[PDB]
């Protein structure tokens, strides 16, 4: 098995630029990795204080005085015990899938492979992180690995859900970078239509009161101004923390600020 670590070009991910201009690994090598984790810093104050306290406890000697206790009680095991458990599990068990697990996995593969088509058609450029049959076999392997922990002789939907969630956290998150704006040929008319629609919406709707997506579609599209990409325009306006809020199961669109 291969465990690899690397940095992007320019050092940081530089979320302002395209994903293809940030990852120098070709599609040939990136298809052989079951899980890819893109790691970023969020610079939050609470997390920074928690990490600072955790790191200072390590240096001042307060680490060991805690750790042994948990390793004693019920929550941690030593390296040698975990090594012996790993070797016992690998030499004793080799689980198998159930008929319902295959049905749940096939639909997830179809969904995650459909999404890539819409993303590639919208961005009019090929995806840097690929989704292939190896990505289905990876989820199968993760399901069986999860089953291996409990020495279970069969893998079921309980393990399938966790494997799917891990795959969504690892690879689908990396694929779905969702660029706010790249100023490329894709959405070229949108470069002005975004401001046009923002002005039309902010003149129609004062700082109070709300509207609906149904009305904001029907009436603003009867004039043939539809672009099929306005789904994320509302979210981008929401990102300003003032223009748009979504409430009531996403039905209600509320004007909250300038």
């Amino acid at each position: 098995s291969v465990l690899a670590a690397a940095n992007p070009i320019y050092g940081r991910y530089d979320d302002l630029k395209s994903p293809g201009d940030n990852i120098d690994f070709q599609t040939t090598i990136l298809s052989r990795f079951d899980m890819i984790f893109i790691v970023k810093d969020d610079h939050n104050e609470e997390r920074d204080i928690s990490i600072a306290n955790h790191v200072i406890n390590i240096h001042t000697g307060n680490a060991n005085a805690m750790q042994n206790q948990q390793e004693e009680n019920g929550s941690e095991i030593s390296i040698e015990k975990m090594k012996r458990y790993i070797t016992y599990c690998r030499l004793k068990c080799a689980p198998r899938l159930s008929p319902q697990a295959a049905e749940k996995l096939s639909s997830n593969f179809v969904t995650i492979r459909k999404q890539l088509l819409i993303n590639e058609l919208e961005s009019t450029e090929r995806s840097s992180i690929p989704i292939t049959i190896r990505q289905l076999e990876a989820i199968i392997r993760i399901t069986e690995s999860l089953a291996k922990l409990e020495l279970s002789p069969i893998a079921q939907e309980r393990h399938v859900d966790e494997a799917i969630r891990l795959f969504q956290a690892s690879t689908m998150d990396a694929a779905s970078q969702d660029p706010i704006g790249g100023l490329n040929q894709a959405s070229g008319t949108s470069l002005s239509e975004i401001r046009r629609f923002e002005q039309e919406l902010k003149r129609r709707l004062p700082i109070g009161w709300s509207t609906s997506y149904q009305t904001l579609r029907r009436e603003f599209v009867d004039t043939h101004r539809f672009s099929q990409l306005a789904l994320d325009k509302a979210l981008y306006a929401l990102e300003k923390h003032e223009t748009i809020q979504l409430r009531h199961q996403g039905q209600n669109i509320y004007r909250s600020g300038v």
Binding site: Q26, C93, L97, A102, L117, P153
Partner: protein
């Protein structure tokens, strides 16, 4: 049977298994009877799982990887005989597979100095050694099946074919069939292929319980006694052996009439093929017709053989399927 689709490539492999008839001609020449196939395609397209199958099903097969091979390791190497004391030659991969097949993987990743040697073996089918006082010509008559990747990660349809493949033209001319395979996203294809793969991954060998790891050790018991329908693999091996050793078909006029019309139609057209068409396409039609004639267990080449060869080469060059 564990690969979903790729019917035409599987037909081409079968035609490779039953090679053509070699013609010895004056001036010390021979027309090659081997069929050489190249596969260029996108990542994860089951290119490498067919080479492994050819390794197992064929009578003689030698496996090679581009980056882990050398020119002196493919043709021959000068060594010494400890027992007697002379200096001798040791066979390489190409010459060890005489009347066999060589399966090369990651063919584009091979160094240039390495790629010249394979050229000569593909052209003359002979190796020339003129080193250390050993002047010899070695016979190497092998069929080549190869798999490669385009210059970029994936095949681009908005660029000319020669830009996509980094291989030179001289090397590319020596392959009978070049198959460009592409993975296209379609919901029905995904639903079928995912179902097939999930069905495959749920196979239990007889005599094993659920959750029992496979004991691929044999417990040191090497041997007990020391010496729609599908067909089983040993029967296929017997069929291929019998066809190769018992039938030698000869060409006929009415098949030539079909071959010439197909060649003339293909040459004079404005369709943009993934590979250029040249005077060596006729020899490919003849070889494919001879192979299909061998498949039928007949001593003559018929019109149906020419039609099948024409359909296969039209699919390969055009994709008109």
């Amino acid at each position: 049977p564990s690969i979903y689709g790729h019917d035409h490539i599987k037909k081409a492999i079968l035609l490779m298994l039953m090679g053509g008839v070699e013609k010895n001609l004056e001036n010390g020449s021979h027309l090659r009877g081997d069929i050489n196939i190249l596969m260029v395609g996108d990542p994860s397209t089951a290119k490498s799982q067919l080479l492994r199958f050819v390794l197992n099903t064929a009578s003689l097969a030698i496996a090679t990887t581009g980056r882990g091979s050398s020119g002196v390791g493919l043709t021959a190497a000068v060594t010494t005989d400890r027992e007697t004391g002379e200096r001798r030659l040791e066979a390489g991969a190409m010459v060890l597979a005489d009347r066999g097949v060589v399966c090369i993987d990651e063919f584009d990743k091979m160094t240039d100095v390495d790629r010249v040697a394979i050229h000569e073996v593909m052209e003359q089918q002979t190796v020339t050694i003129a080193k250390a006082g050993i002047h010899t010509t070695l016979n190497a008559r092998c069929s080549v099946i190869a798999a490669a990747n385009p210059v970029f990660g994936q095949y681009d349809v908005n660029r000319d074919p020669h830009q996509n493949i980094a291989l030179p033209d001289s090397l590319l001319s020596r392959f009978d069939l070049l198959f460009v395979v592409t993975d296209d996203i379609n919901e029905i294809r995904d639903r079928s292929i995912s179902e097939h793969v999930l069905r495959t991954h749920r196979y239990l060998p007889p005599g094993y319980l659920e959750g029992e790891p496979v004991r691929e050790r044999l417990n040191l018991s090497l041997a007990v006694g020391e010496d729609p329908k599908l067909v089983t693999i040993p029967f296929l091996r017997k069929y291929v052996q019998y066809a190769k050793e018992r039938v030698i078909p000869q060409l006929t006029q009415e098949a030539i009439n079909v071959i010439v019309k197909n060649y003339t139609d293909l040459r004079n057209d404005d369709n943009t093929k993934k590979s250029p068409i040249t005077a060596r396409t006729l020899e490919t039609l003849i070889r494919l017709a001879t192979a299909h004639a061998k498949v039928r267990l007949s001593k003559t080449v018929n019109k149906v053989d020419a039609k099948v060869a024409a359909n296969l080469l039209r699919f390969a060059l055009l994709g008109e399927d």
